[PDB]
């Protein structure tokens, strides 16, 4: 349950 | 008539979106004049995101480590530097589609439009609000960082947000275009929680005036109230306190409908104490708080750009 | 994570919007190649809108009666003709910003993005659905006719709607880009009513799968049902019948979450018979029916254009 | 209570 840095693809 | 979550036209912002790759990491960048702005965790590896020192990570990189792509054309990076949590990549070409733009920082309760992007390409546009806990309830997946929030006035695009991360609760955090985070959030993949959120009261009243303008008047009552008696009920239901400036901001909508603000506050008091009883307001069963008074005036008067 | 009413990027459509004036009447036009498309009631006067014969009104006009403005430039009209309820104004200049486009007609329950315009200038963008009664619940004021609804696939803009009128109930009516109205509505300022609307059931289930994808599972139950027992309850609550094709369309979302469609239908059955009991799904207290299964897959997989 | 053709200005 930690934050997510939203990089890479998709 | 009608009232929708309306976002600004995204054309001006679409022309400034690029893809920034560094190593195995890629995200979206904002290209204005000869500078590309992107979140700084692009220089991070998957194993270097729990406790990263961006000062160390950045001096470990050169200009050739940054792959900047604008469509088919690969932009040549000729300078790089850090500004808080964003990266400024100087490129040899100025963006010919650069509009008149501004870098502003907004207050909780203000709204803006988001152009969610992936690999530099726009995927959608929706409306958002800066929650009182400095989060936003957005729609973001992996690779959406670098997407920007903005408002448009006349010809000028007021950039006010850049996407960075998603909190464990599902809400999202980010910075202004100078790289300064909204709220007490840092760009580390660590356990982080936002402060308890509250309802933007002045927005709910503005949304109530929007309903009256569009023929929804079932919630209106003959009763009035004082600002102090209303705020005592607002605090019990986790609503933000209403200030005299709020009553002055709602002035135009108050005169246009002939409903005093304190009279409208009495309708909100009843809706909060009794609920809606199976009814709907503007097609919603919840009191909407993501419409500023300007948002209502904009939608109900047809202001263009 | 997160789920919002997300509209398509409007840049490609913004470049095709013009202003069409005829007499004292003005509205928005769609400029593709050397043709401008606009609603035909632009040739109407205020007194000529109760019972207008557009065949008579059009032959009473010449090419010089049509003021077409693209920004500062006034487009020269060199041809005019009527196609059902739209006007085709041939101009001497092809729109250089013309994208790959299509003229499609959508089915009730399908969604699209609207670029509300006034005087040829875009004012906002929002998402809409074609209701089962062929109306749309939009946000339109006087002078918004000629605004278009559209979808975007890859590089191709699929134009599917053009705005015309507002019904007395506040809902709006319009045509496809060939000028054929959606539903039994005519472009006269007369008393007109739409058929009773129903809830798009397959969209509600798709929106329920969107909630499961984003961590909202409080409505799930261990029970299942058959397509016939569910449809018997759907008819009682004014929901559209669920077909086997609907169950096949929801296939991807069903496998991605591991929830059978008929199992999800049992959750919808309970929500319809018991309500939500103060709970919310994806930040809404009502069952949302303006998200197609493709809309959910698009938002939750990050498809760009 | 009649329909409105939404042209002219605004």
For chain B, helix (H) and strand (E) counts, in that order, are 8, 13
Nearest CA in chain C to B123: C304
Nearest to C110 by CA among C16, C34, C206, C194: C206
Contacts across the B-C interface (CB distance below 8 Å) = 159
In this complex, the residue of C2, C280, C286 whose CB is nearest that of residue B140 is C2
- Residue D7 C-alpha, separation from nearest chain C C-alpha, in angstroms: 4
In this complex, the residue of A1, A2, A9 whose CB is nearest that of residue B142 is A9
User: Mutating which of A5, A9, A10 best tests the B interface, going by the most B Cβ atoms within 10 A?
Assistant: A5
Are A5 and B192 in contact by the 8 Å Cβ rule? The answer is no
DSSP codes of every residue in B69-125: EETTEEEPEEEEEEETTEEEEEESS--TTPPSEEE--PPTT-EEEEEEEETTEEEEE
- Which CATH code fits B201-300? 1.10.1840.10
Cβ separation of B299 and C139 shorter than 8 Å?
A: yes
Between the alpha carbon of residue B260 and those of residues B220, B256, B265, the distances in Å are 11, 10, 9
Q: What is the dihedral of CA B167, B168, B169, B174, to 10 degrees?
A: 0
In this complex, the residue of A1, A5, A8 whose CB is nearest that of residue B191 is A1
User: Mutating which of D2, D4, D7, D9 best tests the C interface, going by the most C Cβ atoms within 10 A?
Assistant: D7
What is the SS3 string spanning chain C?
CCCCCCECCCHHHHCCEEEEEECCEEEEEEEECCEEEEEHHHHCCHHHCCCCCHHHHHHCCCHHHCEEEECCEEECEEEEEEECCEEEEEECCCCCCCCCEEECCCCCCCEEEEEEEECCEEEEEEEEECCCCCCECCCCCCCCCCCEEEEEECCEEEEEEEEEEECCCCCEEEECCCCCECCCCCCCCCCCCCCCCCECHHHHHHHHHHHHHCCCCCCCCCCCCCHHHHHHHHHHCCECCCCHHHHHHCHHHHHHHCCCHHHHHHHHHHHHHHCCCCCCECCECCCCCCCCHHHHHHHHHCCCC
- Residue D5 C-alpha, separation from nearest chain C C-alpha, in angstroms: 4
Cβ separation of C138 and B4 shorter than 8 Å?
A: yes
Contacts of B173 in chain C (CB under 8 A): none
Residue B118 burial (CB count, 10 A): 28
Cβ–Cβ contact C40 with D under 8 A: no
Buried b (16+ CB within 10 A) or exposed e, B234-262: beeeebbebeeebbebbeebbeebebebb
Contacts of B164 in chain A (CB under 8 A): 5-6
Nearest CA in chain B to C119: B304
Nearest to B3 by CA among B113, B127, B109: B127
Are C105 and C99 in contact by the 8 Å Cβ rule? The answer is no
How far from the centroid of its chain's Cα atoms is residue B66's Cα? 28
Are C14 and B122 in contact by the 8 Å Cβ rule? The answer is no
Contacts of A9 in chain B (CB under 8 A): 26, 118-119, 142-143
Cβ separation of B145 and A3 shorter than 8 Å?
A: no
Chains D and A touch (3+ CB pairs under 8 A): no
Q: Using CB atoms, list chains with 3+ pairs below 8 Å to chain D.
A: C
Nearest CA in chain D to C170: D3
Contacts of D1 in chain C (CB under 8 A): 168, 191
In this complex, the residue of C165, C185, C190 whose CB is nearest that of residue D6 is C165
The residue length of chain D stands at 10
Which residues of chain B from 106 to 135 reach within 8 Å of chain A, CB to CB? 118-119
What's the number of CA atoms in the CB half-sphere (13 Å) around residue C156? 7
Contacts of A4 in chain B (CB under 8 A): 142, 165-166, 189
Give the experimental resolution in Å. Answer: 2.5
Nearest to B188 by CA among B68, B281, B85, B301: B85
In this complex, the residue of A4, A8, A9 whose CB is nearest that of residue B165 is A4
In this complex, the residue of C121, C166, C305 whose CB is nearest that of residue B304 is C121
d(CA B12, CA C182) in angstroms, rounded, equals: 32
Nearest CA in chain C to B122: C304
The DSSP bridge pattern shows strands C67-70 and C86-91 to be: unpaired
- Residue B129 C-alpha, separation from nearest chain C C-alpha, in angstroms: 12
Cβ separation of A7 and B168 shorter than 8 Å?
A: no
Are B240 and B287 in contact by the 8 Å Cβ rule? The answer is no
Are C140 and C170 in contact by the 8 Å Cβ rule? The answer is no
Between the alpha carbon of residue C281 and those of residues B8, C211, C234, C252, C277, the distances in Å are 26, 7, 19, 21, 11
d(CA B240, CA B225) in angstroms, rounded, equals: 17
In this complex, the residue of A1, A2, A7 whose CB is nearest that of residue B143 is A7
Are A9 and B26 in contact by the 8 Å Cβ rule? The answer is yes
Instruction: List the B73-75 sheet strands across, edge first.
Output: B73-75, B67-70, B17-22, B25-32, B35-39, B86-91, B77-83
Are B285 and B276 in contact by the 8 Å Cβ rule? The answer is yes
d(CA B41, CA B54) in angstroms, rounded, equals: 8
Q: What topology is assigned to C11-91 in CATH?
A: Thrombin, subunit H (2.40.10)
């Amino acid at each position: 349950n930690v934050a997510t840095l939203q990089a890479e693809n998709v | 008539s009608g009232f929708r979550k309306m976002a600004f036209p995204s054309g001006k912002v679409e022309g400034c979106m690029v893809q920034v790759t560094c190593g195995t990491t890629t995200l979206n960048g904002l290209w204005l004049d000869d500078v590309v702005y992107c979140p700084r965790h692009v220089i991070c590896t998957s194993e270097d995101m729990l406790n990263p020192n961006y000062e160390d990570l950045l001096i470990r990189k050169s200009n050739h480590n940054f792959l900047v792509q604008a469509g088919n054309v690969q932009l040549r990076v000729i300078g790089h530097s850090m500004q808080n949590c964003v990266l400024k990549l100087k490129v040899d070409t100025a963006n010919p589609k650069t509009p008149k733009y501004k870098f502003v920082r907004i207050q909780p309760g203000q709204t803006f439009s988001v152009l969610a992007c992936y690999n530099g390409s726009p995927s959608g546009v929706y409306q958002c609000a800066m929650r009182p806990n400095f989060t936003i309830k957005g729609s973001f997946l992996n690779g959406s960082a670098g997407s920007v929030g903005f408002n448009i006035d006349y010809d000028c695009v007021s950039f006010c947000y850049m996407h960075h991360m998603e909190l464990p609760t599902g809400v999202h955090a980010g910075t202004d275009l100078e790289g300064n985070f909204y709220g007490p959030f840092v760009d580390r993949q660590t356990a982080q929680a936002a402060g308890t959120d509250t309802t933007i009261t002045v927005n709910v009243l503005a949304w109530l005036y929007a309903a009256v303008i569009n023929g929804d008047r079932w919630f209106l009552n003959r009763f009035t109230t004082t600002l102090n008696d209303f705020n005592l009920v607002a605090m019990k239901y986790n609503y933000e306190p209403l200030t005299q400036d709020h009553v002055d901001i709602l002035g135009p909508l108050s005169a246009q409908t002939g409903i005093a603000v304190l009279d409208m506050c009495a309708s909100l008091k009843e809706l909060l104490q009794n609920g809606m009883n199976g009814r709907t307001i503007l097609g919603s069963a919840l009191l909407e708080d993501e419409f500023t008074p300007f948002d209502v005036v904009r939608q109900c008067s047809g202001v263009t750009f």
